[PDB]
Amino acid sequence: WRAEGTSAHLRDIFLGRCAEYRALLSPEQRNKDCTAIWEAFKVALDKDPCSVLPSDYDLFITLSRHSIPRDKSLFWENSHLLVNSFADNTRRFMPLSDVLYGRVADFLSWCRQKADSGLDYQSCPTSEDCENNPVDSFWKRASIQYSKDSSGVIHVMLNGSEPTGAYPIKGFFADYEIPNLQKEKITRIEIWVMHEIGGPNVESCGEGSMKVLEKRLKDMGFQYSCINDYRPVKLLQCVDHSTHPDCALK
Amino acid sequence: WRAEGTSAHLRDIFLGRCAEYRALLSPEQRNKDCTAIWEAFKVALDKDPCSVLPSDYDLFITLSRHSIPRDKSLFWENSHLLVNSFADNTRRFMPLSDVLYGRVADFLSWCRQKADSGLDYQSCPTSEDCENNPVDSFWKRASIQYSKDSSGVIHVMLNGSEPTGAYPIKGFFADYEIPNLQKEKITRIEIWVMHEIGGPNVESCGEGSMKVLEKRLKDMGFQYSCINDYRPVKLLQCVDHSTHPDCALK
Ligand SMILES: *[C@@H]1O[C@H](CO)[C@@H](O[C@@H]2O[C@H](CO)[C@@H](O)[C@H](O)[C@H]2NC(C)=O)[C@H](O)[C@H]1NC(C)=O
Numbered sequence: 131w132r133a134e135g136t137s138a139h140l141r142d143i144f145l146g147r148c149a150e151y152r153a154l155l156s157p158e159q160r161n162k163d164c165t166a167i168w169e170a171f172k173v174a175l176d177k178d179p180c181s182v183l184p185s186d187y188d189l190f191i192t193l194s195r196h197s198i199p200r201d202k203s204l205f206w207e208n209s210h211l212l213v214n215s216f217a218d219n220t221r222r223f224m225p226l227s228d229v230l231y232g233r234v235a236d237f238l239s240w241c242r243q244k245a246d247s248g249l250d251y252q253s254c255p256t257s258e259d260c261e262n263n264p265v266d267s268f269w270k271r272a273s274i275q276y277s278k279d280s281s282g283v284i285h286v287m288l289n290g291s292e293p294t295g296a297y298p299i300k301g302f303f304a305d306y307e308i309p310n311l312q313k314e315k316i317t318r319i320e321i322w323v324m325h326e327i328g329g330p331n332v333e334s335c336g337e338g339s340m341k342v343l344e345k346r347l348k349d350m351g352f353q354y355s356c357i358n359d360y361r362p363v364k365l366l367q368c369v370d371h372s373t374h375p376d377c378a379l380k
Numbered sequence: 381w382r383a384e385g386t387s388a389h390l391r392d393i394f395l396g397r398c399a400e401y402r403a404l405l406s407p408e409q410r411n412k413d414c415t416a417i418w419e420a421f422k423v424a425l426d427k428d429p430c431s432v433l434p435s436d437y438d439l440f441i442t443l444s445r446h447s448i449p450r451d452k453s454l455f456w457e458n459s460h461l462l463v464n465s466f467a468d469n470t471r472r473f474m475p476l477s478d479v480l481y482g483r484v485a486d487f488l489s490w491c492r493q494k495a496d497s498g499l500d501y502q503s504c505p506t507s508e509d510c511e512n513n514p515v516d517s518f519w520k521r522a523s524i525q526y527s528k529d530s531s532g533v534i535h536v537m538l539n540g541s542e543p544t545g546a547y548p549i550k551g552f553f554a555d556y557e558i559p560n561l562q563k564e565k566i567t568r569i570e571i572w573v574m575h576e577i578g579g580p581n582v583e584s585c586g587e588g589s590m591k592v593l594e595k596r597l598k599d600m601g602f603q604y605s606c607i608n609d610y611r612p613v614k615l616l617q618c619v620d621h622s623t624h625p626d627c628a629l630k
């Protein structure tokens with residue numbers, strides 16, 4: 131297999147993350163059974179590493195699903211760390227990584243051995259090794275739920291320094307989230323196209339792939355807007371380049 | 381008891397934080413038994429809620445003790461969240477909360493029932509209810525170790541907008557960390573007096589309590605320097621005040 135082996139101590143981490151997240155939930159929905167949640171997730175670890183479908187995680191979702199505050203959803207592509215850092219544990223925004231069912235698996239890997247019953251810590255199938263592996267099918271199901279339950283102002287953070295452009299036509303955002311947005315409960319979609327400090331400006335609002343994304347969103351009838359290097363996030367990026375002309379203060 | 385009662389699901393959170401932190405440790409010091417570490421921590425939990433001494437966590441420390449990179453220690457007072465956020469999980473600096481024995485207990489509470497084998501999820505003694513309570517004794521032992529294991533350039537983040545002064549003369553830094561610094565392996569000490577955006581300038585370098593701190597450190601033979609609103613941290617504060625004049629970019 132051509133992808134990371136399952137994460138060491140998967141269960142403790144999962145349960146730990148789940149416990150800490152409960153505290154964030156409001157009491158009226160704080161009653162989440164982390165053990166039951168782990169057992170529903172655990173199902174994919176009993177199947178063939180190439181025979182897991184997004185629907186296998188349905189129970190998991192039912193047991194961990196909770197509401198996402200209006201105008202608090204934050205989608206993204208090629209900016210994982212900047213998103214978690216900026217969102218700051220649900221304080222600023224609530225991206226998938228900061229929603230119960232996403233928090234428990236963020237950055238982790240998992241899959242069962244090809245022929246044995248135990249977990250494969252050596253490697254796990256990549257989308258290329260086979261389409262229906264545990265990790266991809268997981269995110270597809272989680273990405274779908276996240277989009278469906280998002281409302282208000284939809285924020286999206288894309289990478290303008292990414293060599294393949296800011297919008298991957300075949301990413302999770304394009305194939306599993308955009309098609310699941312409830313236009314009925316979405317006011318407008320705002321995009322933040324970020325560039326590395328000094329780093330390359332491969333694409334800015336309205337250029338290359340950004341035209342394709344913008345066109346799709348507008349055809350689907352969404353109110354659309356795009357901002358290059360949205361200030362708050364730029365300031366966070368700047369923390370690591372305090373002495374760079376782009377980061378100098380008045 | 382007047383302080384917060386023990387954290388719900390304390391064991392799962394503990395083991396989860398411990399397992400996750402293991403990945404951040406050097407392969408040489410990656411051999412950490414979380415379960416064993418927990419059992420050691422529990423040795424203080426089985427005692428009377430007002431009869432726990434720092435020495436009770438000696439075993440805990442022993443089994444979780446790991447080295448701290450040179451020049452990466454970051455001490456502080458009245459700026460817990462700003463430090464955790466700036467340290468960015470051992471990426472920039474490694475504060476007590478980003479060291480194994482600190483990470484497993486950051487923000488949590490714990491204590492045995494006044495008179496019963498179970499944990500008291502109702503309330504835990506504060507420093508007033510009694511001095512030798514589980515939580516305060518914990519941080520004393522942890523602070524002493526963190527201090528003893530620090531080296532190179534020592535950094536300290538203080539809140540210059542703190543009504544009672546930047547340097548608490550009766551806090552953990554003053555009573556349990558400064559006394560334990562190893563001058564022999566310390567090059568210099570640098571202070572960062574931070575102020576809230578716009579917030580009050582109660583004290584700055586060379587004023588009030590700062591005069592006391594500087595004089596104490598100089599009397600001990602350390603090289604000293606103090607910076608007002610250290611830039612990188614300022615930028616991080618600015619993330620939440622992007623439009624404020626103190627945060628305008630050039
Ligand atoms: C935005 O995309 C760029 C380009 O892919 C990322 O920067 C690269 O990151 C890799 C892995 O750390 C490095 O090997 C390259 O040297 C980087 N290139 C450049 C030009 O910096 C960047 O990390 C992405 N930004 C975020 C927030 O994810």
Ligand SMILES: *[C@@H]1O[C@H](CO)[C@@H](O[C@@H]2O[C@H](CO)[C@@H](O)[C@H](O)[C@H]2NC(C)=O)[C@H](O)[C@H]1NC(C)=O
Pocket residue numbers: 458459460461462539540541542543576579580
């Ligand atoms: C620095 O100290 C100030 C003053 O104690 C802190 O700000 C106060 O925090 C309390 C508790 O949340 C608020 O109710 C007050 O409104 C705040 N006042 C002011 C003037 O800010 C501040 O949180 C501290 N900064 C850090 C980073 O810990």
